[PDB]
Design a protein around this ligand. Structure first.
Ligand SMILES: Nc1c(C(=O)NCc2ccc(F)cc2F)c(=O)n(O)c2ncc(CCCCCO)cc12
Ligand SMILES: Nc1c(C(=O)NCc2ccc(F)cc2F)c(=O)n(O)c2ncc(CCCCCO)cc12
Ligand SMILES: [Mg+2]
Ligand SMILES: [Mg+2]
Ligand SMILES: [Mg+2]
Ligand SMILES: [Mg+2]
Ligand SMILES: [Zn+2]
Ligand SMILES: [Zn+2]
Ligand SMILES: [Zn+2]
Ligand SMILES: [Zn+2]
Lengths: 259, 65, 47, 242, 259, 47, 65, 242
DNA sequence: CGGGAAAATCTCTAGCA
DNA sequence: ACTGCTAGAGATTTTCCCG
DNA sequence: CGGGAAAATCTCTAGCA
DNA sequence: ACTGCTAGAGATTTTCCCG
């Protein structure tokens, strides 16, 4: 068995065989075989099999510059809704990106901007523009396009829609604005059966209304809880949600008392 | 007060778990804070982070709710 | 404590091992030879 | 449900509340409340206003949502028809505009603007724009020094006037006001779609004569007959089309 | 309703809105909306969401030329097993491919060869070589790499293994042969827990043995069936498999009699 | 009888409609303007 | 004869359905022809095309079978 | 199972069949049959042979699998050590070679061939190659005209000698013979792995003394004690390691 | 019978130009 | 008339093994 | 209650440099 | 210390609607 481990290492240093081959050729149990493989530096070549989940708060947008017909289209998307804005800019430079971002901050209540590490978005001009508008910048991991998985997707969609109306407009900027119109107000689907624009209006209105209602309720409903004194959040017919020193927990009616 | 409790319980929340990449069904928003949202899905209370919940008042409420 | 192998930036060759500073749901931040890098978990094996 | 309908119609006969109030008070389906409102004889958000303003020798297009005060300005290089049509198409893509009320200028009546209006389905007409224009020029004069060019100054003034100037009744900024008005408009449109869908139905209950369908729940059906709203169990009334 | 259809078409010819938008804005039922969309030529832009299944008979191989370190590696794979052969060829021309394919036909019992539409495989030299060896050629769809989904995959694997032993060999051909060795005899897994070479030996031996046994059984077990006179294949305790004029069917014991 | 739209060869633009000659599990063979083509079903919409 | 029936029933078949892209478990080869293969999986008789079945005699049969 | 063990060991005491026959006759687990074979006192596939052959001024490496007759030839440019090591590494990657029996030539004893043998785990030694070489040259002389160069002729001769020349006992070609021999070798290796795994166990049954484990089924356990094979129910015998 | 350990199976992503 | 797949990594389910 | 129709939901691929 | 997603196409499940 120990001679098994010795021979297995002496062979893996040559062939680099996976744990099944070493467990089968040297009668090792799978644990020792995996421990042999996991200790080799060259046999670690494939990462995890998963996917993250991008920020989808109701106040974060995603920007990116795409290229179509030799022109540069700057595209931003409201992550939580899918309402996209787009504009054909003359050059993929910092000034145009800062101008478009200040426009977008004037139109809709943006609170965060998530971009790739393109020079357009990484510049001091978009940074000064974000500092003026109270916008928080959030760059993705370098060379990880999937981190902007929303906007890139919209890019595809946007381009496709241009491919349907490109012959209805002489120039390209007109076609891009028509594609924005079609994607926002003439293509329903999504979560609530809404179009994009209806969904973003609903998202923002619901954010405001829920903030107001929760503020009022928290102003009125003042109950200390014991289960250390936390804060009471919601108690209905079988459960109690408490907030214990920046840690929201949920308990049953048992193991909990209210004052 | 109970009127506003029931009002804030009328909104709908679509959320996602930590390793579940498909959007869960429309829950019932019970509480919405600065960083977390307490919902009730299929009569099970959950606490989802703010960065994983789309909170909409589905205006297809003109038939039910 | 831990070891992390990563594929950083358009370089198909893997590298490591590197210390694991903070593992968050979606991506990790690691320290390879006094270089603090951020890497998506799809491009990082943690032992 | 049965306890709420008579209460709501009696309350309306008392002091004629609105249908949203009845819906939020007695937990009624909005169609039933709309019908109760339409039972008494005694008982807009897409009207944008465009204009051009000269400043420092450059021309800015200003579009004011009349019902809210939300503003959209843009420095255009020349007061021509093409740029006006482009800006109007942008505004049509961004916000749900349904009618544009201009000032019969030399550019808003061009053929290109007319084409861009026929495409986006925008009706055209031919005094809130003056006060909002003066306010926007005031804010530009205030915040000019914080930028170098004029485009950035105009965009900063728009930002300030949309999300940093709270007034009116409840102190809501212009952005919150416009999103609330558009949410109300979406609610009205969805209710109208529901009414139009349910309108061309017919029901026969308990038998009895014809009646117009108002609501079709799980096992209950709320109908109207001779200006009287009734409820019946499902299997006691059969529905047909017309 | 009919005016609904008219207005819906007059609008879709402009905006090109999906069936949900036309069903929501004009009160059409989903069937009519889908019928409106499915009749527009520009709104048909995404095909099916599926994947085929490559030929995995025990007598079909897949060839492809990959490029590594500026050299050309010709790689063939037995589809049903995963046993790969590889050889560094001096140029991606027809003669080298024909020579390697004749080699592979001499070594293992190949009966079909599935390649992309590379000039190497499409040539008259590989065709004459396939005609001499009784090999049947089967080209994939042009510009559809997934049709060779096996070999391309192996390419990846092969390259990865070279990336583990490239520093154990001076030249490249030696490293490629070492990678073939490692992939065939020192990396278990697959379906039967075998390595590649063990699995291909099992595949071929089982093919031969099953052919022999089935030939003998068909020679002995001669029963006409009635359920039209078909041929009997297998009858066990609750079912009967018949072969009715080149159409294999399965029936229960009921609705079937044997002579 | 049928209609088939396809994306043939490294050309992102779609084309059609074309008659459906034979639909097999995995790919179809179609006839567009006397041109007989084979297309994987992932690149063909059939109506 | 029954000996050879049982012999040909000892082999194992891994197959795939028409739209199922994952390899089904090890069935029991009942009959193998020129273009089709009749197998029995979980006591259900199936007929899979020859181009969708890997037929191996798993030499991990030295413990069972 | 119990009815088969005594029958098989009595049959072996009768005329000493092989363990594969006992396994295929009484449906016994192969380990039990192997032990029954090892119960009587009275009761190779990786030996390749390489050589070089001159023809038309070019040198061809010929590797013959001794136990089957399957051949592998390859025209090499020069009878050097590097090309021999390359061909041997190819052959080691393709077929499960475990020993190479060469002819003590000037190239098969080089340091590069020795390295390629130490890497692939191939033992080296130092008369079937002559007859097979003459047969391969005969087939080359036959099929030479059907090709232009010599490489293609040699490969065609290899194809003919591997899959188109059936002889021997059952008329099986060389390819079928080698795949059958390698399948038998794989069976033997897997049985040996099973025996080696089960060997370092120990069992205590019904109590009783030590015993060596032979097979561990579902609820039955087949053990050996004092050269006598017995079967017991699982919960009547406990297993330990050693 | 029933809790852990362990083996087996399911899910899924990178890369194959 | 033709066609995505392979291997590893981690989560989840099923089996094993005594107590 | 129970068969079809219809709506809703699940699965999944292309493309986003 | 941060992160794949969107829409359509077809298969599959669940609801509806009278008989
Ligand atoms: N490479 C870029 C991609 C891209 O790779 N698309 C392929 C792709 C693959 C998968 C997927 F999900 C989406 C997806 F888009 C992109 O889309 N954008 O907008 C970029 N914008 C800017 C830069 C410059 C980076 C500077 C160097 C880093 O410091 C690169 C990119
Ligand atoms: N393009 C080729 C690819 C390829 O595209 N890989 C990317 C890819 C993507 C996805 C996937 F699953 C696999 C996969 F490999 C390839 O792999 N091979 O071997 C080729 N061999 C030869 C020709 C020349 C064709 C001549 C013009 C046609 O008449 C092209 C290719
Ligand atoms: Mg970018
Ligand atoms: Mg991009
Ligand atoms: Mg190729
Ligand atoms: Mg390739
Ligand atoms: Zn290793
Ligand atoms: Zn009234
Ligand atoms: Zn269309
Ligand atoms: Zn004996």
């Amino acid at each position: 068995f120990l001679d098994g481990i010795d021979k297995a290492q002496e062979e893996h240093e040559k062939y680099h065989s996976n744990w099944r081959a070493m467990a089968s050729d040297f009668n090792l149990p799978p644990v020792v075989a995996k421990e042999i493989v996991a200790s080799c530096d060259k046999c670690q070549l494939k990462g995890e099999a998963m996917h993250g989940q991008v920020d989808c708060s109701p106040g974060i947008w995603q920007l990116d510059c795409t290229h179509l017909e030799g022109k540069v289209i700057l595209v931003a998307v409201h992550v939580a809704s899918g309402y996209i804005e787009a504009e054909v800019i003359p050059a993929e430079t910092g000034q145009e990106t800062a101008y478009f971002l200040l426009k977008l901050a004037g139109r809709w209540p943006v609170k965060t901007v998530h971009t790739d590490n393109g020079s357009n978005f990484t510049s001091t001009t978009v940074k000064a523009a974000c500092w003026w508008a109270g916008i928080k910048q959030e760059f993705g991991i370098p060379y990880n396009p999937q981190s902007q998985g929303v906007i890139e997707s919209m890019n595809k969609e946007l381009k496709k829609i241009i491919g349907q109306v490109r012959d209805q407009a002489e120039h390209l900027k007109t076609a891009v604005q028509m594609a924005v119109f079609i994607h926002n107000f003439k293509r329903k689907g999504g979560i609530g059966g809404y179009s994009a624009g209806e969904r973003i209006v609903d998202i923002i209105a619901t954010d405001i209304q829920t903030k107001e209602l929760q503020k009022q309720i928290t102003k009125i409903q003042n109950f200390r809880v014991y289960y250390g004194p936390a804060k009471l959040l919601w108690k209905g017919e079988g459960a109690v949600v408490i907030q214990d020193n920046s840690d929201i927990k949920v308990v049953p009616r048992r193991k909990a008392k209210i004052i | 007060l109970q009127k506003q409790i029931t009002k804030i319980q009328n909104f709908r929340v679509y959320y996602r778990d930590s390793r579940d990449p498909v959007w869960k069904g429309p829950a019932k928003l019970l509480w919405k804070g600065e960083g977390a949202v307490v919902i009730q899905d299929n009569s099970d209370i959950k606490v989802v982070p703010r960065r994983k919940a789309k909170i909409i008042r589905d205006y297809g409420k003109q038939m039910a709710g | 404590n831990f070891r992390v192998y990563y594929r950083d930036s358009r370089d198909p060759v893997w590298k490591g091992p590197a210390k694991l500073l903070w593992k968050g749901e979606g991506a990790v931040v690691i320290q390879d030879n006094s270089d603090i890098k951020v890497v998506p978990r799809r491009k990082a094996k943690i032992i």
